[PDB]
Design a protein around this ligand. Structure first.
Ligand SMILES: CC#CCOc1ccc(C(=O)N[C@H](C(=O)NO)C(C)(C)N)cc1
Ligand SMILES: [Zn+2]
Length: 297
C-alpha cells in the first residue's frame, strides 16, 4: 500500500512573519495516523489548535489565513506546499506567533528541514481524493478549475502589465517533474510601489530582498537575480499546491489557475467539497499501479 507519512523527529526553525514582521519559533512534531496537519499556537493561554482544513480558512487578502474564533494563523501556504510536495499526511505545527516564518520566501528551507529530520511511513493507507468531473469557480477575469487527470498536474497563468513580466504561463506534471527541483525554490514576490501602501496597512512589515523577489519599476532589485526564468508563475504554482493541501488529502487531478490567488483557491476547494459527486476518496494497495509517486522516506 501507499502509506501515510509523518516526521521521524521534531524539527525547529526560527524566522519572521512576512506581513507582521514578528519574530516566530516554528516546531514540526510527528503525529499519529489520520491526524492531518494541525497548527498549535503556543504563545496563547490557553493554547489554541487549528486544523489545517478548508473550513478553517478565514482571510485570503494577501496570504491564506486559518481562523478559530478571534485566533489566527497567517501565511500557511508555503509550509503546506512543502508538506504536500513531500507527502506528509500527519504533523503538529507549533508556532509562537500568529504568522508562519517566511524563511527565504519559498518552500525550499521547509523541504530541507523536513528531509533533514526524515519521513516516517505509518502502517495505514494514504487517502487520496480523485477528481471525477470538472469543478470551476470564476470571479471577473479570474478562474480556478479542477479537471480529471490521472496523476497530479498544475497549470497557471498570470497577467501583470509590468516590464519584468518573461514566461507568464507554466504547467508542471508531477509524473514528469519533481516538486523539489522545479517548484520548491520559487520565492514570493512584491512590487516596490505596493510595499509602501502595504506597510501603511501593517502588511509586508518583514518583507525584504532576503525573503522575496523585490520588483522595481523596470527590473528585479535582488542582486543575484532569479532562481528560475519563470520564478513568478512557479511561485503561484507553489501557492496553489499549499492552498489545495487544505483539502486534507492529496488530489488526483489537474488544477488550472488563471490570474487566481488564495481567495479563489479556497473558493474552488469549498465548491469541490460541496460537489460530492465530483470526487471520491481512494487508496492504492500497489504503489506500482498508483498515479502519484512519492520519494523514498
Ligand atoms: C521590501 C520588500 C518586500 C517583499 O514584500 C512582499 C509583499 C507581498 C507579498 C505577497 O503578497 N505575496 C503573495 C504570496 O506569495 N502569498 O503566498 C503573492 C505573490 C501571491 N501576491 C510578497 C512579498
Ligand atoms: Zn506565496
Amino acid at each position: 500500500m501507499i502509506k501515510q507519512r509523518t516526521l521521524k523527529n521534531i524539527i525547529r526553525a526560527t524566522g519572521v512573519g512576512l506581513h507582521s514582521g514578528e519574530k516566530v519559533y516554528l516546531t514540526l512534531k510527528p503525529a499519529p495516523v489520520d491526524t492531518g496537519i494541525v497548527f498549535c499556537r503556543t504563545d496563547l493561554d490557553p493554547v489554541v489548535e487549528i486544523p489545517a482544513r478548508a473550513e478553517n480558512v478565514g482571510e485570503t487578502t494577501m496570504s491564506t489565513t486559518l481562523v478559530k474564533g478571534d485566533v489566527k494563523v497567517d501565511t500557511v501556504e508555503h509550509l503546506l506546499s512543502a508538506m504536500a510536495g513531500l507527502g506528509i499526511d500527519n504533523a503538529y505545527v507549533e508556532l509562537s506567533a500568529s504568522e508562519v516564518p517566511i524563511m527565504d520566501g519559498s518552500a525550499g528551507p521547509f523541504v530541507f528541514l523536513i528531509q533533514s529530520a526524515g519521513l516516517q511511513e505509518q502502517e495505514a493507507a494514504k487517502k487520496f481524493i480523485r477528481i471525477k468531473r470538472e469543478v470551476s469557480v470564476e470571479e471577473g477575469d479570474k478562474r480556478a478549475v479542477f479537471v480529471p487527470f490521472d496523476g497530479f498536474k498544475v497549470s497557471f497563468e498570470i497577467d501583470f502589465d509590468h516590464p519584468v513580466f518573461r514566461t507568464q504561463q507554466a504547467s508542471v506534471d508531477f509524473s514528469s517533474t519533481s516538486f523539489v527541483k522545479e517548484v520548491s525554490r520559487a520565492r514570493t514576490f512584491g512590487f516596490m510601489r505596493d510595499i509602501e501602501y502595504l506597510r501603511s496597512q501593517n502588511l509586508a512589515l518583514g518583507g525584504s530582498v532576503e525573503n522575496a523577489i523585490v520588483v522595481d519599476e523596470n527590473r528585479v532589485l535582488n542582486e543575484d537575480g532569479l532562481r528560475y526564468e519563470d520564478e513568478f508563475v512557479k511561485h503561484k504554482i507553489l501557492d496553489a499546491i499549499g492552498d489545495l493541501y487544505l483539502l486534507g488529502n492529496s488530489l488526483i487531478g489537474e488544477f488550472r489557475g488563471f490570474k487566481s490567488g488564495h481567495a479563489l483557491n479556497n473558493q474552488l476547494l469549498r465548491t469541490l467539497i460541496a460537489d460530492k459527486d465530483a470526487w471520491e476518496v481512494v487508496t492504492f494497495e500497489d504503489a506500482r499501479t498508483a498515479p502519484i509517486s512519492y520519494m523514498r522516506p
